[PDB]
Write an enzyme that holds these catalytic residues in place. Structure first.
Site, PDB file in Angstrom:
ATOM      1  N   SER A 116     -11.694  11.374  -3.522  1.00 54.93           N
ATOM      2  CA  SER A 116     -11.196  11.093  -2.183  1.00 54.93           C
ATOM      3  C   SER A 116      -9.658  10.850  -2.266  1.00 54.93           C
ATOM      4  CB  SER A 116     -11.898   9.866  -1.652  1.00 54.93           C
ATOM      5  OG  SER A 116     -11.518   8.689  -2.371  1.00 54.93           O
ATOM      6  N   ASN A 134      -8.741   5.692   3.345  1.00 51.78           N
ATOM      7  CA  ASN A 134      -9.511   6.546   2.447  1.00 51.78           C
ATOM      8  C   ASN A 134     -10.371   7.623   3.095  1.00 51.78           C
ATOM      9  OD1 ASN A 134     -12.231   6.700   0.543  1.00 51.78           O
ATOM     10  ND2 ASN A 134     -10.363   6.847  -0.565  1.00 51.78           N
ATOM     11  N   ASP A 174     -15.232  -4.024   9.935  1.00 52.57           N
ATOM     12  CA  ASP A 174     -16.424  -3.566   9.252  1.00 52.57           C
ATOM     13  C   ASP A 174     -17.267  -4.623   8.551  1.00 52.57           C
ATOM     14  OD1 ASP A 174     -17.798  -1.061   8.811  1.00 52.57           O
ATOM     15  OD2 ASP A 174     -17.201  -1.165   6.724  1.00 52.57           O
ATOM     16  N   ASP A 185     -12.730   9.328  -7.702  1.00 47.56           N
ATOM     17  CA  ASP A 185     -13.913   9.941  -7.127  1.00 47.56           C
ATOM     18  C   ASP A 185     -13.557  11.202  -6.324  1.00 47.56           C
ATOM     19  OD1 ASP A 185     -12.710   8.725  -4.808  1.00 47.56           O
ATOM     20  OD2 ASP A 185     -14.462   7.649  -4.205  1.00 47.56           O
ATOM     21  N   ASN A 204      -7.801   9.450  -5.538  1.00 50.15           N
ATOM     22  CA  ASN A 204      -8.629   8.515  -6.282  1.00 50.15           C
ATOM     23  C   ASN A 204      -9.479   9.274  -7.302  1.00 50.15           C
ATOM     24  OD1 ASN A 204      -8.858   7.026  -3.077  1.00 50.15           O
ATOM     25  ND2 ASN A 204      -7.862   6.115  -4.775  1.00 50.15           N
ATOM     26  N   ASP A 259      -6.264   8.588  -0.360  1.00 51.34           N
ATOM     27  CA  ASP A 259      -5.780   7.573   0.583  1.00 51.34           C
ATOM     28  C   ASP A 259      -4.533   8.082   1.302  1.00 51.34           C
ATOM     29  OD1 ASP A 259      -7.710   5.771  -0.486  1.00 51.34           O
ATOM     30  OD2 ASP A 259      -6.322   5.189  -2.023  1.00 51.34           O
ATOM     31  N   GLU A 291       0.811  -1.198   0.000  1.00 49.36           N
ATOM     32  CA  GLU A 291       0.000   0.000   0.000  1.00 49.36           C
ATOM     33  C   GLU A 291       0.850   1.255   0.000  1.00 49.36           C
ATOM     34  OE1 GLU A 291      -3.118   0.421  -0.489  1.00 49.36           O
ATOM     35  OE2 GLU A 291      -3.981  -1.527  -0.097  1.00 49.36           O
TER      36      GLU A 291
END
Length: 129
Positions: free
Chosen positions: A50, A59, A101, A48, A46, A52, A35
């Protein structure tokens, strides 16, 4: 800070990640490797809008606030800059909420594509833990 492999394994172990929700420490070190290349300061934008952040590339649409992802939640209750620190505590604590989650570590695309089903034990071999 750019962590060494064994240095990062030892800090994640101290912060409770070995076998957290059944994921052994090699999984977490492998995920951080691919990562962020163990760099606490890594950021990536990203499509969209957003971004990271940090060693585990958390995110901003769901987990932290960076003030520029319109309509995003801040489920770890932190500014995204907190995840870029040399102290990995904030990133570890938020990662624990993410892996709990429902989808486990599949929440990290690089873990799913590069660590899942591999000999992740290799990532901590040779480390005095």
């Amino acid at each position: 800070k750019v962590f060494g492999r064994c240095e990062l394994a030892a800090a994640m172990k101290r912060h409770g990640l070995d076998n957290y929700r059944g994921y052994s420490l090699g999984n977490w070190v492998c995920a951080a490797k691919f990562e962020s290349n163990f760099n606490t300061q890594a950021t990536n934008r990203n499509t969209d809008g957003s971004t990271d952040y940090g060693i585990l590339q958390i995110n901003s649409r769901w987990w932290c606030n960076d003030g520029r992802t319109p309509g995003s939640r801040n489920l770890c209750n932190i500014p995204c800059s907190a995840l870029l620190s040399s102290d990995i505590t904030a990133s570890v604590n938020c990662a624990k909420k993410i892996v709990s989650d429902g989808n486990g570590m599949n929440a990290w695309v690089a873990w799913r594509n590069r660590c899942k089903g591999t000999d992740v034990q290799a990532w901590i071999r040779g480390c005095r833990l």
